[PDB]
Amino acid sequence: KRQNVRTLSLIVCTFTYLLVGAAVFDALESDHEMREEEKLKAEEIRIKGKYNISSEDYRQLELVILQSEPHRAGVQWKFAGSFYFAITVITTIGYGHAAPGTDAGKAFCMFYAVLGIPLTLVMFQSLGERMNTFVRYLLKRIKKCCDVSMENMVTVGFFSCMGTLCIGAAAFSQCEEWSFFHAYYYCFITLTTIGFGDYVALQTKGALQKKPLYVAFSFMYILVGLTVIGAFLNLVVLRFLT
Amino acid sequence: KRQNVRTLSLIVCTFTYLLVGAAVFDALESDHEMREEEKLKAEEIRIKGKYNISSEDYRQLELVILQSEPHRAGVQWKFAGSFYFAITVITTIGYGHAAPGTDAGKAFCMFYAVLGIPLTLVMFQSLGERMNTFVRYLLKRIKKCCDVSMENMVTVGFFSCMGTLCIGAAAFSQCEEWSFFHAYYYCFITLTTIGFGDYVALQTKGALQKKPLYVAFSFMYILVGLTVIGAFLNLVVLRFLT
Numbered sequence A, B: 001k002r003q004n005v006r007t008l009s010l011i012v013c014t015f016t017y018l019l020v021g022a023a024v025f026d027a028l029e030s031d032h033e034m035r036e037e038e039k040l041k042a043e044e045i046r047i048k049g050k051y052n053i054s055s056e057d058y059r060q061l062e063l064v065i066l067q068s069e070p071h072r073a074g075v076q077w078k079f080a081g082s083f084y085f086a087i088t089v090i091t092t093i094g095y096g097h098a099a100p101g102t103d104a105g106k107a108f109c110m111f112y113a114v115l116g117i118p119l120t121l122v123m124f125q126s127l128g129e130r131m132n133t134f135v136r137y138l139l140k141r142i143k144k145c146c147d148v149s150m151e152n153m154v155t156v157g158f159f160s161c162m163g164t165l166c167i168g169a170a171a172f173s174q175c176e177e178w179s180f181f182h183a184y185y186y187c188f189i190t191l192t193t194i195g196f197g198d199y200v201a202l203q204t205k206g207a208l209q210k211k212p213l214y215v216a217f218s219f220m221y222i223l224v225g226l227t228v229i230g231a232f233l234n235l236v237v238l239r240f241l242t
């Protein structure tokens, strides 16, 4: 019946989209990955030959460097670091810069996520609804000064999202030595709750302990962007959900 | 008015929860992080003293090791690797094992996420609704063989979630050299779309190219668990949402 027809039609489209994306990603990244692997292998071979590093100690050095990578940015388990980790956990971002090393800590993190995800989702939904109402009121007032259609609301939301993305990209590029495109990409990744972790803010020269204003601004920007995205999402998707 | 009262009451509870979580995480991880940092610093100092490694070349070695970490697991941009990356992107997991290195690739990934997230969400919601209806029908048939309350449905969903988590943990522990607790934690992280990236499957001895059955089973388990979690989320969260 329809329900099954729609359920099976969605699956086929999703599978086709996944296949197309995988094919494009392979065709675009195979040569680059091969070249990077060749260059890295040549460099490491040259370094090993020059320094006569033993093969057994190479694995130990790799493990030490990998384990000490988060520690090179300072102390990541202070009050600011713990707050950042909790914010990433509740928002399902998963940056991966710092992870618990204790089984009890892992269990506590799991319980924290379980007890916090629905509350954060409900709060974000309420904030998005309130922002949508405020935006509608502002648009009505502006039109009176100068009825509202959906398309106008959709365009206003898209423009607001683009402006927020541009502002965040400029702010993060002018305070962390990042390119405009790289900052925009990082902001988009952060606001979509994906969290690749390739670019992580508040990880340079101990900014988590010496720049409280920057941390506060980053938290405010993250919350504002999440609220903005939660309105565009529920005003284009929730209509077809139920 | 109530609306603002509820909106402001949610915020206070969320902030208190964040503060409590940050305090607990700090009090639980400060000493462990300090000990790990001290041990790593001592080990690296001893290694540098023994091998007489120059300071300038140490940064180059660290950069080479960091850039070559994904490549140590094989080829991550093949058909299987591209499919895995696309699956992680559309599901907003963000493992971070492989990331694009080209600006055009990053733009394509951003467009892919934008065009794929709503479709995946709608498909997951439909699958969860269908599974919920099937579970209700099965429960009614079982009760007839031996009306349904909401508490019974919640208990059945929780039991199904626990069973799926246990099965996935056992399967991933018996095929990737992992402990039961670590496998359970990794499965929980994967199913919540957090994606810390500390534990990533299909990254050992080139399993992405030599074990197609394992990759297919992992994909099926991920999809099933995502549907199961989405169903429970629909039961608990949507009733209080609208």
Ligand SMILES: CC(C)CCC[C@@H](C)[C@H]1CC[C@H]2[C@@H]3CC=C4C[C@@H](OC(=O)CCC(=O)O)CC[C@]4(C)[C@H]3CC[C@]12C
Pocket: A114, A115, A118, A119, A122, B002, B005, B006, B009, B010, B013, B236, B240
């Ligand atoms: C196993 C997992 C999925 C459990 C998830 C727990 C939720 C069912 C709880 C956790 C936080 C709760 C919320 C915390 C705070 C509030 C504000 C509260 O508002 C008021 O008390 C003032 C307004 C009014 O009088 O309704 C209404 C319930 C609500 C949304 C709660 C609804 C139920 C929530 C989402």
Ligand SMILES: CC(C)CCC[C@@H](C)[C@H]1CC[C@H]2[C@@H]3CC=C4C[C@@H](OC(=O)CCC(=O)O)CC[C@]4(C)[C@H]3CC[C@]12C
Pocket: A167, A171, A175, A211, A213, A214, A217
């Ligand atoms: C209404 C729209 C179009 C504009 C919104 C105003 C922005 C232009 C302002 C509002 C908040 C500002 C930010 C608030 C806090 C900071 C931290 C501040 O950092 C420091 O002062 C310490 C580090 C340093 O020395 O750079 C640098 C500027 C910045 C990013 C500000 C940049 C300019 C921002 C984004």
Ligand SMILES: CC(C)CCC[C@@H](C)[C@H]1CC[C@H]2[C@@H]3CC=C4C[C@@H](OC(=O)CCC(=O)O)CC[C@]4(C)[C@H]3CC[C@]12C
Pocket: A079, A080, A083, A208, A209, A210, A212, A213, A215, A216, A217, A219
């Ligand atoms: C209704 C909305 C607008 C409430 C917004 C609340 C903010 C004003 C608060 C909430 C969380 C706070 C942050 C939580 C944690 C920290 C780390 C804290 O760092 C330390 O305590 C160590 C470094 C130092 O000694 O300054 C500095 C303040 C800061 C950035 C706080 C700044 C003020 C913030 C952003």
Ligand SMILES: CC(C)CCC[C@@H](C)[C@H]1CC[C@H]2[C@@H]3CC=C4C[C@@H](OC(=O)CCC(=O)O)CC[C@]4(C)[C@H]3CC[C@]12C
Pocket: A005, A006, A009, A010, A013, A236, A240, B114, B115, B118, B119, B122
């Ligand atoms: C900028 C971003 C937010 C754009 C998001 C795009 C969505 C508005 C699109 C993308 C995929 C679309 C879905 C793709 C497939 C289908 C199945 C389709 O079902 C059928 O064609 C059979 C049943 C029927 O006849 O209705 C109904 C619409 C729907 C849910 C579409 C609804 C609109 C969706 C969610």
Ligand SMILES: CC(C)CCC[C@@H](C)[C@H]1CC[C@H]2[C@@H]3CC=C4C[C@@H](OC(=O)CCC(=O)O)CC[C@]4(C)[C@H]3CC[C@]12C
Pocket: B167, B171, B175, B211, B213, B214, B217
């Ligand atoms: C109804 C519930 C209670 C049980 C569901 C059945 C499971 C016990 C089965 C169903 C799918 C099975 C998996 C399907 C595929 C594989 C890949 C398979 O890998 C290989 O054959 C190649 C690698 C190797 O040589 O180990 C190892 C077993 C495993 C994980 C299977 C383990 C047992 C599973 C989870």
Ligand SMILES: CC(C)CCC[C@@H](C)[C@H]1CC[C@H]2[C@@H]3CC=C4C[C@@H](OC(=O)CCC(=O)O)CC[C@]4(C)[C@H]3CC[C@]12C
Pocket: B079, B080, B083, B208, B209, B210, B212, B213, B215, B216, B217, B219
């Ligand atoms: C309605 C539902 C049940 C549909 C389920 C579809 C699956 C049966 C398909 C969809 C995606 C497929 C996978 C997509 C990609 C790959 C990588 C592919 O690897 C290669 O082509 C290189 C290695 C080799 O030569 O085997 C092996 C098959 C596999 C695991 C496929 C196995 C079969 C899968 C899981």
Ligand SMILES: [K+]
Pocket: A092, A093, A094, A095, A194, A195, A196, B093, B094, B095, B194, B195, B196
């Ligand atoms: K992530």
Ligand SMILES: [K+]
Pocket: A094, A095, A096, A195, A196, A197, B094, B095, B096, B195, B196, B197
């Ligand atoms: K990550």
Ligand SMILES: [K+]
Pocket: A096, A197, B096, B197
């Ligand atoms: K990582």
Ligand SMILES: [K+]
Pocket: A091, A092, A093, A192, A193, A194, B091, B092, B093, B192, B193, B194
């Ligand atoms: K997510």
Ligand SMILES: [K+]
Pocket: A092, A093, A094, A193, A194, A195, B092, B093, B094, B193, B194, B195
């Ligand atoms: K994520």
